[PDB]
Design an enzyme around this catalytic site. Structure first.
Site, PDB file in Angstrom:
ATOM      1  N   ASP A   1       0.809  -1.211   0.000  1.00  0.00           N
ATOM      2  CA  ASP A   1       0.000   0.000   0.000  1.00  0.00           C
ATOM      3  C   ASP A   1       0.851   1.274   0.000  1.00  0.00           C
ATOM      4  O   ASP A   1       0.443   2.292  -0.584  1.00  0.00           O
ATOM      5  CB  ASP A   1      -0.952  -0.016   1.197  1.00  0.00           C
ATOM      6  N   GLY A   2       2.025   1.251   0.636  1.00  0.00           N
ATOM      7  CA  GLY A   2       2.913   2.400   0.549  1.00  0.00           C
ATOM      8  C   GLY A   2       3.334   2.702  -0.877  1.00  0.00           C
ATOM      9  O   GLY A   2       3.323   3.863  -1.304  1.00  0.00           O
TER      10      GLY A   2
ATOM     11  N   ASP B   1      -2.633  14.134  21.916  1.00  0.00           N
ATOM     12  CA  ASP B   1      -1.444  13.898  21.090  1.00  0.00           C
ATOM     13  C   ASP B   1      -1.613  14.375  19.659  1.00  0.00           C
ATOM     14  O   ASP B   1      -0.618  14.693  19.014  1.00  0.00           O
ATOM     15  CB  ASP B   1      -1.087  12.412  21.038  1.00  0.00           C
TER      16      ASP B   1
ATOM     17  N   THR C   1      -9.863   2.142   6.905  1.00  0.00           N
ATOM     18  CA  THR C   1      -9.247   0.873   7.285  1.00  0.00           C
ATOM     19  C   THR C   1      -7.813   1.049   7.763  1.00  0.00           C
ATOM     20  O   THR C   1      -7.212   0.084   8.266  1.00  0.00           O
ATOM     21  CB  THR C   1      -9.260  -0.138   6.124  1.00  0.00           C
TER      22      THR C   1
ATOM     23  N   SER D   1      -6.987   2.226  13.632  1.00  0.00           N
ATOM     24  CA  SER D   1      -6.192   1.960  14.824  1.00  0.00           C
ATOM     25  C   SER D   1      -6.571   2.906  15.956  1.00  0.00           C
ATOM     26  O   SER D   1      -6.265   2.626  17.123  1.00  0.00           O
ATOM     27  CB  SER D   1      -4.686   2.116  14.525  1.00  0.00           C
TER      28      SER D   1
HETATM   29  N1  LIG Z   1      -2.172  12.497  25.589  1.00  0.00           N
HETATM   30  C1  LIG Z   1      -2.015  12.681  27.057  1.00  0.00           C
HETATM   31  O1  LIG Z   1      -2.910  12.510  27.837  1.00  0.00           O
HETATM   32  C2  LIG Z   1      -0.663  13.098  27.601  1.00  0.00           C
HETATM   33  C3  LIG Z   1       0.412  13.332  26.699  1.00  0.00           C
HETATM   34  C4  LIG Z   1       1.652  13.727  27.255  1.00  0.00           C
HETATM   35  C5  LIG Z   1       1.750  13.862  28.642  1.00  0.00           C
HETATM   36  N2  LIG Z   1       0.694  13.629  29.445  1.00  0.00           N
HETATM   37  C6  LIG Z   1       0.862  13.788  30.847  1.00  0.00           C
HETATM   38  O2  LIG Z   1       1.414  14.922  31.124  1.00  0.00           O
HETATM   39  C7  LIG Z   1       2.393  14.629  32.286  1.00  0.00           C
HETATM   40  C8  LIG Z   1       3.420  15.568  32.429  1.00  0.00           C
HETATM   41  O3  LIG Z   1       3.047  16.768  31.727  1.00  0.00           O
HETATM   42  P1  LIG Z   1       2.744  18.146  32.472  1.00  0.00           P
HETATM   43  O4  LIG Z   1       1.821  17.897  33.658  1.00  0.00           O
HETATM   44  O5  LIG Z   1       4.001  18.734  32.916  1.00  0.00           O
HETATM   45  O6  LIG Z   1       2.062  19.111  31.411  1.00  0.00           O
HETATM   46  P2  LIG Z   1       0.587  18.871  30.885  1.00  0.00           P
HETATM   47  O7  LIG Z   1       0.576  18.706  29.428  1.00  0.00           O
HETATM   48  O8  LIG Z   1      -0.241  20.057  31.247  1.00  0.00           O
HETATM   49  O9  LIG Z   1      -0.043  17.608  31.598  1.00  0.00           O
HETATM   50  C9  LIG Z   1      -1.374  17.207  31.069  1.00  0.00           C
HETATM   51  C10 LIG Z   1      -2.410  17.089  32.191  1.00  0.00           C
HETATM   52  O10 LIG Z   1      -2.089  15.772  33.039  1.00  0.00           O
HETATM   53  C11 LIG Z   1      -2.281  16.096  34.261  1.00  0.00           C
HETATM   54  N3  LIG Z   1      -1.566  15.138  35.127  1.00  0.00           N
HETATM   55  C12 LIG Z   1      -0.242  15.032  35.402  1.00  0.00           C
HETATM   56  N4  LIG Z   1      -0.054  14.007  36.253  1.00  0.00           N
HETATM   57  C13 LIG Z   1      -1.292  13.438  36.520  1.00  0.00           C
HETATM   58  C14 LIG Z   1      -1.777  12.350  37.298  1.00  0.00           C
HETATM   59  N5  LIG Z   1      -0.881  11.523  38.078  1.00  0.00           N
HETATM   60  N6  LIG Z   1      -3.081  12.113  37.296  1.00  0.00           N
HETATM   61  C15 LIG Z   1      -3.951  12.842  36.578  1.00  0.00           C
HETATM   62  N7  LIG Z   1      -3.556  13.868  35.830  1.00  0.00           N
HETATM   63  C16 LIG Z   1      -2.255  14.169  35.794  1.00  0.00           C
HETATM   64  C17 LIG Z   1      -1.818  17.589  34.334  1.00  0.00           C
HETATM   65  O11 LIG Z   1      -2.400  18.187  35.417  1.00  0.00           O
HETATM   66  P3  LIG Z   1      -2.183  19.776  35.777  1.00  0.00           P
HETATM   67  O12 LIG Z   1      -3.380  20.560  35.285  1.00  0.00           O
HETATM   68  O13 LIG Z   1      -2.058  19.925  37.301  1.00  0.00           O
HETATM   69  O14 LIG Z   1      -0.918  20.348  35.128  1.00  0.00           O
HETATM   70  C18 LIG Z   1      -2.437  18.102  33.052  1.00  0.00           C
HETATM   71  O15 LIG Z   1      -3.876  18.406  33.357  1.00  0.00           O
HETATM   72  C19 LIG Z   1       2.971  13.267  31.803  1.00  0.00           C
HETATM   73  O16 LIG Z   1       3.612  12.599  32.956  1.00  0.00           O
HETATM   74  C20 LIG Z   1       1.952  12.639  31.332  1.00  0.00           C
HETATM   75  O17 LIG Z   1       1.287  11.712  32.258  1.00  0.00           O
HETATM   76  C21 LIG Z   1      -0.495  13.254  28.982  1.00  0.00           C
HETATM   77  N1  LIG Z   2      -0.652   3.765  14.177  1.00  0.00           N
HETATM   78  C1  LIG Z   2      -1.080   3.424  12.794  1.00  0.00           C
HETATM   79  O1  LIG Z   2      -1.908   2.591  12.553  1.00  0.00           O
HETATM   80  C2  LIG Z   2      -0.449   4.161  11.630  1.00  0.00           C
HETATM   81  C3  LIG Z   2       0.554   5.139  11.882  1.00  0.00           C
HETATM   82  C4  LIG Z   2       1.118   5.794  10.762  1.00  0.00           C
HETATM   83  C5  LIG Z   2       0.662   5.451   9.487  1.00  0.00           C
HETATM   84  N2  LIG Z   2      -0.290   4.514   9.312  1.00  0.00           N
HETATM   85  C6  LIG Z   2      -0.705   4.211   7.987  1.00  0.00           C
HETATM   86  O2  LIG Z   2       0.310   3.990   7.220  1.00  0.00           O
HETATM   87  C7  LIG Z   2      -0.049   4.645   5.865  1.00  0.00           C
HETATM   88  C8  LIG Z   2       1.052   4.945   5.057  1.00  0.00           C
HETATM   89  O3  LIG Z   2       2.185   4.188   5.521  1.00  0.00           O
HETATM   90  P1  LIG Z   2       2.859   3.026   4.660  1.00  0.00           P
HETATM   91  O4  LIG Z   2       1.780   2.108   4.100  1.00  0.00           O
HETATM   92  O5  LIG Z   2       3.635   3.623   3.580  1.00  0.00           O
HETATM   93  O6  LIG Z   2       3.836   2.232   5.629  1.00  0.00           O
HETATM   94  P2  LIG Z   2       3.292   1.297   6.785  1.00  0.00           P
HETATM   95  O7  LIG Z   2       3.788   1.745   8.091  1.00  0.00           O
HETATM   96  O8  LIG Z   2       3.772  -0.092   6.533  1.00  0.00           O
HETATM   97  O9  LIG Z   2       1.711   1.272   6.764  1.00  0.00           O
HETATM   98  C9  LIG Z   2       1.095   0.538   7.901  1.00  0.00           C
HETATM   99  C10 LIG Z   2       0.106  -0.524   7.412  1.00  0.00           C
HETATM  100  O10 LIG Z   2      -1.205   0.216   6.874  1.00  0.00           O
HETATM  101  C11 LIG Z   2      -1.549  -0.420   5.820  1.00  0.00           C
HETATM  102  N3  LIG Z   2      -2.423   0.446   5.004  1.00  0.00           N
HETATM  103  C12 LIG Z   2      -2.110   1.505   4.217  1.00  0.00           C
HETATM  104  N4  LIG Z   2      -3.238   1.983   3.659  1.00  0.00           N
HETATM  105  C13 LIG Z   2      -4.300   1.212   4.111  1.00  0.00           C
HETATM  106  C14 LIG Z   2      -5.710   1.196   3.926  1.00  0.00           C
HETATM  107  N5  LIG Z   2      -6.370   2.161   3.071  1.00  0.00           N
HETATM  108  N6  LIG Z   2      -6.413   0.263   4.555  1.00  0.00           N
HETATM  109  C15 LIG Z   2      -5.850  -0.644   5.369  1.00  0.00           C
HETATM  110  N7  LIG Z   2      -4.537  -0.676   5.583  1.00  0.00           N
HETATM  111  C16 LIG Z   2      -3.769   0.229   4.973  1.00  0.00           C
HETATM  112  C17 LIG Z   2      -0.189  -0.851   5.177  1.00  0.00           C
HETATM  113  O11 LIG Z   2      -0.404  -1.913   4.343  1.00  0.00           O
HETATM  114  P3  LIG Z   2       0.813  -2.666   3.535  1.00  0.00           P
HETATM  115  O12 LIG Z   2       1.194  -3.926   4.281  1.00  0.00           O
HETATM  116  O13 LIG Z   2       0.320  -3.030   2.126  1.00  0.00           O
HETATM  117  O14 LIG Z   2       2.054  -1.778   3.400  1.00  0.00           O
HETATM  118  C18 LIG Z   2       0.542  -1.299   6.424  1.00  0.00           C
HETATM  119  O15 LIG Z   2       0.092  -2.703   6.709  1.00  0.00           O
HETATM  120  C19 LIG Z   2      -0.717   5.954   6.376  1.00  0.00           C
HETATM  121  O16 LIG Z   2      -1.508   6.534   5.270  1.00  0.00           O
HETATM  122  C20 LIG Z   2      -1.420   5.578   7.385  1.00  0.00           C
HETATM  123  O17 LIG Z   2      -2.835   5.294   7.109  1.00  0.00           O
HETATM  124  C21 LIG Z   2      -0.858   3.865  10.324  1.00  0.00           C
HETATM  125 MN   LIG Z   3       3.544  -0.384   3.795  1.00  0.00          MN
END
Ligand SMILES: NC(=O)c1ccc[n+]([C@@H]2O[C@H](COP(=O)([O-])OP(=O)(O)OC[C@H]3O[C@@H](n4cnc5c(N)ncnc54)[C@H](OP(=O)(O)O)[C@@H]3O)[C@@H](O)[C@H]2O)c1
Ligand SMILES: NC(=O)c1ccc[n+]([C@@H]2O[C@H](COP(=O)([O-])OP(=O)(O)OC[C@H]3O[C@@H](n4cnc5c(N)ncnc54)[C@H](OP(=O)(O)O)[C@@H]3O)[C@@H](O)[C@H]2O)c1
Ligand SMILES: [Mn+2]
Ligand SMILES: NC(=O)c1ccc[n+]([C@@H]2O[C@H](COP(=O)([O-])OP(=O)(O)OC[C@H]3O[C@@H](n4cnc5c(N)ncnc54)[C@H](OP(=O)(O)O)[C@@H]3O)[C@@H](O)[C@H]2O)c1
Ligand SMILES: NC(=O)c1ccc[n+]([C@@H]2O[C@H](COP(=O)([O-])OP(=O)(O)OC[C@H]3O[C@@H](n4cnc5c(N)ncnc54)[C@H](OP(=O)(O)O)[C@@H]3O)[C@@H](O)[C@H]2O)c1
Ligand SMILES: [Mn+2]
Ligand SMILES: [Mn+2]
Ligand SMILES: [Mn+2]
Lengths: 260, 260, 260, 260
Positions: D45-46, D146, D157, D162
Site C-alpha cells: 500500500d505504501g 497527542d 481501514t 487503529s
Molecule cells: N495524551 C495525554 O494525555 C498526555 C500526553 C503527554 C503527557 N501527558 C501527561 O502529562 C504529564 C506531564 O506533563 P505536564 O503535567 O508537565 O504538562 P501537561 O501537558 O499540562 O499535563 C497534562 C495534564 O495531566 C495532568 N496530570 C499530570 N499528572 C497526573 C496524574 N498523576 N493524574 C492525573 N492527571 C495528571 C496535568 O495536570 P495539571 O493541570 O495539574 O498540570 C495536566 O492536566 C505526563 O507525565 C503525562 O502523564 C499526557
Molecule cells: N498507528 C497506525 O496505525 C499508523 C501510523 C502511521 C501510518 N499509518 C498508515 O500507514 C499509511 C502509510 O504508511 P505506509 O503504508 O507507507 O507504511 P506502513 O507503516 O507499513 O503502513 C502501515 C500498514 O497500513 C496499511 N495500510 C495503508 N493503507 C491502508 C488502507 N487504506 N487500509 C488498510 N490498511 C492500509 C499498510 O499496508 P501494507 O502492508 O500493504 O504496506 C501497512 O500494513 C498511512 O496513510 C497511514 O494510514 C498507520
Molecule cells: Mn507499507
C-alpha cells in the site's frame, strides 16, 4: 527540619511561597534546598513532577507536599487558602507518611536508568515504530503502532488514562502497559488490552529495525540512539507523601474526573 | 489421594475420562466425588467453572487440573494426548500448587454470598440500569448504562477483556470493575476507565429506582428482587492449581490471543 | 393546520400543553390527534420517540417539534419559555422542513417490519449470542458477544455513542453497526470497528444455534422466537422536522456533550 | 493507451514489472511516465500511495491498478500470478472505472494545499498539542491530546481504524475525524467519538499557543511553522480505479482483517 519550596513562577505562586517562608521563619525551620526533608511544590502537577526529579537521589530522606495553584492539581493536597494551616501542622510534626510505587526504566546501548512517578513511554525517532515485547524472557508480541506507555499506579490517572488504561490503586505495587494506536490486521497482531505487571516481573522492549527511539520519563523526553534494550520494572524506591488529612485515592480520582 | 473427574459429556471427553479412571485404578487411587483432593476437568472453560462451583465449599482441600478438549481452554494445562502422562505424574505426587485470588459477592435484601472465579456482573431486570457506586463508604459515581462487571485476576482474560478491561497477573490480589456501555453526556458522567481495587477495599452498588437486578456469577445468572446492596470484595478464599510444568500466565495469555 | 400535542405527563408538561392548546385556539387551528400535520412533543427524548412511533404510518404528512422539559432533550429545539413564540410562528407558517434518514428492520420466521429513529439492537433471549453477519449476500463475520446495534444518523448520539460508535451528520443517508462486548481470541474474530453502510446496502443477521432474540426498536423491546433473518437497510421513509431557527446538528451535539 | 508501472524495487517486483512491460510491447501500448492513462503499482500500500502522489495533478486522466507483492495490500486487486491476465484484459479495454472520494487539506500562514488518499493528521512540533476545532465557523471544542486524524472513506481501514474510528463505505462522500489520546478531566473535555462530516462541511483547526505543527498526508510528513489555520474538506477531485472483477469494499475489508 530542613525544607525547600518550588514555585510555578507565576505571581500567586511566588507570593504564596514568600508568605510560607516567612511563616516558617517563626518556627526555626531551616530552608535548605540541598538536603531538605520536606519539599513543598506550589503550582500544578508539572511543577510537582519537576520537584520530584530535582530530588530523585534523596527519595527516602524526603516527604513531598503539593499546593494547587495550577489547573487540575492531581498530586495536590492543599488549596492556597490552607497554606497558613499547612505551615503550622508541618512545624509541630502532626502528619503521617504515605508511600507510592515508582517505575524503573533502563536503556542499554553498544546503560542509563531513570525513575518515573507517572510513566515512561517509547516512540520512534520518526518513521514506523516496531518492537518486540519480551516478558520475563518469554517473547510475547511484536508491537507495530505509534508507541507504548508504562505507568505507575498513581500515573494511571495521567497519560495511561487517555490511552484506555485502567486506574490502579497505589497500594498495589505494579506497572501497567498500554498501546498507542496499534496496528491489527490479517498479518499484524497485538494483545490490545492493557497489561498490569507485578513487582517481580521484567518487561523488555527490543528493536526490530530502526534503533533510535524517543523515550520519555514524566515531562522529560530524550532521544536515544543505537538502543539495544528498554527494560521496565517496578522500582525498589518509593515516593513518600506527607498527609495531614485523610484524602483517599478514590476520592482524589472522583474530585478530578467526576466533580469538585 | 481421593480424586474425581468432570466431563464435558461429549464422546472424546467421556472416553478420555474412562481411560484415566482405568489408569488410576493401577495406582490404588480412590475415585471419590464427595471429598476428593484432586478434581480433573475434561472439556473447555465452562466445564472447568462448573467443576469449580461443584466444590466451592472445599476449596482449600482440593487442587484443580484442566484437560483441553474444548475450543479455547484458558484454564487448561493439558491436551488429551498428555492425559496418560498426567495420571503418572499425579500418582507419584510430583506437582506444586499455585493459588489464584477469588471474588466475593454479597447481595442483601429486606444476605446471599457467592464466590466467582471469573467475574460477577450486574444488569437490570429489563429497563434502565442505574446504580450508585460507593467505594469504602465514599460515594464515587452514579452509573447509568447496560451494566457493570467485577473480575478476578484470572477472569480479566474473559468478559472483562471484551469490555476493554486490563489483563491482570494473578499474583496481584485484586478485583477489577468495568462498565457496559455507560451513558455520558452533559448531565450524566462516569469514570469510563476500568478500576482496579486492592484486597482491603469494598465496592458496594446501591439501587436508585428499580430494585430488581440480573446478577451473574461465572456461568450462573440469577434474578434478585428487592435488592438493597451488592457488595464486592476480594475473597479470603483461593483456588489451588496443580502444576506439573511451569506454564506462566503471560505465556497462557499469548497462546490464547496472539498465536498457538 | 391540524395539530396534536404529546405530554410527558408530569405537571409542567401537562400545563405547558394546556397553555399552548389555549394559545392555538386563538388562531383557528384544529387540534386533531387522528390526522395532524404537526405533532408537538413536550418532555424529553423518550417522549419524542413515543410521539414518533404513534404516527409511524403518516410520516410524510407530518412535521415534528420537541419542547425540552426533560433532562437531556437531544431532539428538542425549544425550551418551555419559548413555547408562546412557537405557537405564533407555527400559526403564521414561518418554518422550513428538515428531513433525517430512518432505519428499516425486517424480521422473518417460518415477516415483521419496523421503523427506527434512533436504532434497532439484537441480543439473545438469555444465554450466548452468536450470529452470522451477511453483507449484500457476502458472509462477513460470525459475531460472538452480547449483541449488536444498528443506528440512524441522528441515533449515533444515542446508544451507538455509548458503544464507541462514530457520530454521523444526518445529511448522510446511512446506518451504522456497532458491537456489544465482542469476544475476540485465538478462535473467534470480529471486525471490532463500527461499520457505516450506504443507502443501497443490506445487512442481514442469521442465527447459528439459538433462534430466539431480544429485538429492540428505539424504546420498544420485543421477543422474537424461531427467527430466520433480521434484515437492516436504510429506509425509504424520512422524518420531517419543523425548523424556525437554524440549529445545526454539530451545535446540537456540542450543547449536549461539551457544554450548555 | 499510455501506461506506467511503479515498482517497490525489490527483486520480485522489478521482475514482475519487466515481464509486464514486455507483455505490453506485444499490444502496441506506449509506456509513458509523463502522461499515462493507466498507472500500475507493484508492491504494497505504501508503493500505491507513492504512485498516487506522483500523479496528483492528473487524477481524472488516470485509472490506477495495484498488484500485491507486499504484506497487506489493501488497495491491491491482483496477486502476481494474475499479472499476465491483467496485461491482456487491460489491453483489450474490458474494465469499468470506480471512483473513491479524496480529502483536501489547506494550511495557511502569515496557503499550501494537499490531497490525501488515506488521511491527513496533525501533531505538535514536540510539546503539548492544543487546538480549537471549528466546524462550519461554529466553535465545537478545544482539543488537548497527542493529535488528530482526518480520513477518507477508503482511509478508514488505515490509521483511522487503529484509533477506534469507524469503517466507512467509499460510496459515501465524507471525511472522518478521530482523536489521538485526548485528555478528559474535570477541566478539559472533548467529544471522544469519531465525527463523520458530509461533503459540504468545513472543519478548521486553529492554534491556541504553539503555532508549529507536524502535518502528515498519507506517508508524507512535513513541519509547518507559524500556522494560522488547517482546513479540512472533502475534495472535489476523485481517484479512479480500474476494475476487471467485482471486488466489493466489504469483501476487501473481510479479507484484510477477518481471514484470507
Ligand atoms: N495524551 C495525554 O494525555 C498526555 C500526553 C503527554 C503527557 N501527558 C501527561 O502529562 C504529564 C506531564 O506533563 P505536564 O503535567 O508537565 O504538562 P501537561 O501537558 O499540562 O499535563 C497534562 C495534564 O495531566 C495532568 N496530570 C499530570 N499528572 C497526573 C496524574 N498523576 N493524574 C492525573 N492527571 C495528571 C496535568 O495536570 P495539571 O493541570 O495539574 O498540570 C495536566 O492536566 C505526563 O507525565 C503525562 O502523564 C499526557
Ligand atoms: N498507528 C497506525 O496505525 C499508523 C501510523 C502511521 C501510518 N499509518 C498508515 O500507514 C499509511 C502509510 O504508511 P505506509 O503504508 O507507507 O507504511 P506502513 O507503516 O507499513 O503502513 C502501515 C500498514 O497500513 C496499511 N495500510 C495503508 N493503507 C491502508 C488502507 N487504506 N487500509 C488498510 N490498511 C492500509 C499498510 O499496508 P501494507 O502492508 O500493504 O504496506 C501497512 O500494513 C498511512 O496513510 C497511514 O494510514 C498507520
Ligand atoms: Mn507499507
Ligand atoms: N461478551 C463476553 O465476552 C462474555 C459474555 C458472557 C460470558 N462471558 C464469559 O463466559 C464465561 C462463562 O461462560 P462459558 O465459558 O461457560 O461459555 P462461553 O460463552 O463459551 O464462554 C465464552 C468464551 O470465554 C472463554 N473463557 C472463559 N473463561 C475464560 C478466561 N478466564 N480467560 C479467557 N477466556 C475465558 C470461553 O472459553 P472456552 O472456549 O474454553 O469455552 C469461551 O471461549 C463467563 O465467566 C464469562 O467470563 C463472556
Ligand atoms: N447503554 C445506553 O447508552 C443505552 C441503552 C438503552 C437505550 N439507550 C437509548 O435510550 C433510547 C430510548 O430510551 P429513552 O430515551 O426512552 O430512556 P432513557 O434511558 O432515559 O434514554 C437514555 C438517554 O439517551 C438519550 N437519548 C435518546 N435519544 C438520543 C439521541 N438521538 N441522541 C442523544 N441522546 C439521546 C435520552 O435523553 P433524555 O434525557 O432526553 O431522555 C437519555 O438521556 C434508545 O433509543 C437508545 O438510543 C441507550
Ligand atoms: Mn501541567
Ligand atoms: Mn465455553
Ligand atoms: Mn429519556
Amino acid at each position: 527540619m530542613k525544607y525547600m519550596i518550588t514555585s510555578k513562577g507565576d505571581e500567586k505562586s511566588d507570593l504564596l511561597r514568600l508568605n510560607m517562608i516567612a511563616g516558617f521563619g517563626e518556627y526555626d525551620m531551616e530552608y535548605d534546598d540541598v538536603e531538605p526533608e520536606i519539599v513543598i511544590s506550589i503550582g500544578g502537577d508539572g511543577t510537582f513532577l519537576s520537584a520530584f526529579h530535582q530530588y530523585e537521589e534523596r527519595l527516602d530522606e524526603i516527604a513531598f507536599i503539593g499546593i494547587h495553584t495550577g489547573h487540575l492539581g492531581f498530586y495536590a493536597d492543599f488549596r492556597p487558602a490552607e497554606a497558613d494551616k499547612l505551615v503550622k501542622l508541618l512545624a509541630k510534626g502532626e502528619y503521617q507518611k504515605v508511600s507510592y510505587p515508582l517505575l524503573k526504566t533502563t536503556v542499554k546501548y553498544g546503560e542509563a536508568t531513570y525513575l518515573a512517578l507517572n510513566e515512561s513511554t517509547v516512540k520512534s525517532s520518526g518513521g514506523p515504530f516496531v518492537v518486540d515485547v519480551v516478558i520475563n524472557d518469554i517473547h510475547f508480541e511484536r508491537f507495530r503502532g505509534d508507541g507504548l506507555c508504562m505507568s505507575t499506579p498513581s500515573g494511571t490517572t495521567a497519560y495511561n488514562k487517555s490511552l484506555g488504561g485502567a486506574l490502579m490503586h497505589p497500594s498495589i505495587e505494579a506497572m501497567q502497559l498500554t498501546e498507542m494506536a496499534s496496528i491489527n490486521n490479517r498479518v499484524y497482531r497485538t494483545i490490545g488490552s492493557p497489561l498490569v505487571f507485578p513487582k517481580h516481573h521484567v518487561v523488555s522492549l527490543q528493536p526490530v529495525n530502526d534503533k533510535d527511539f524517543q523515550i520519555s520519563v514524566d515531562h522529560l523526553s530524550i532521544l536515544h540512539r543505537d538502543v539495544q534494550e528498554i527494560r521496565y520494572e517496578v522500582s525498589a524506591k518509593k515516593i513518600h507523601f506527607a498527609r495531614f488529612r485523610s484524602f483517599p485515592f478514590w476520592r482524589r480520582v472522583h474530585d478530578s474526573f467526576i466533580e469538585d
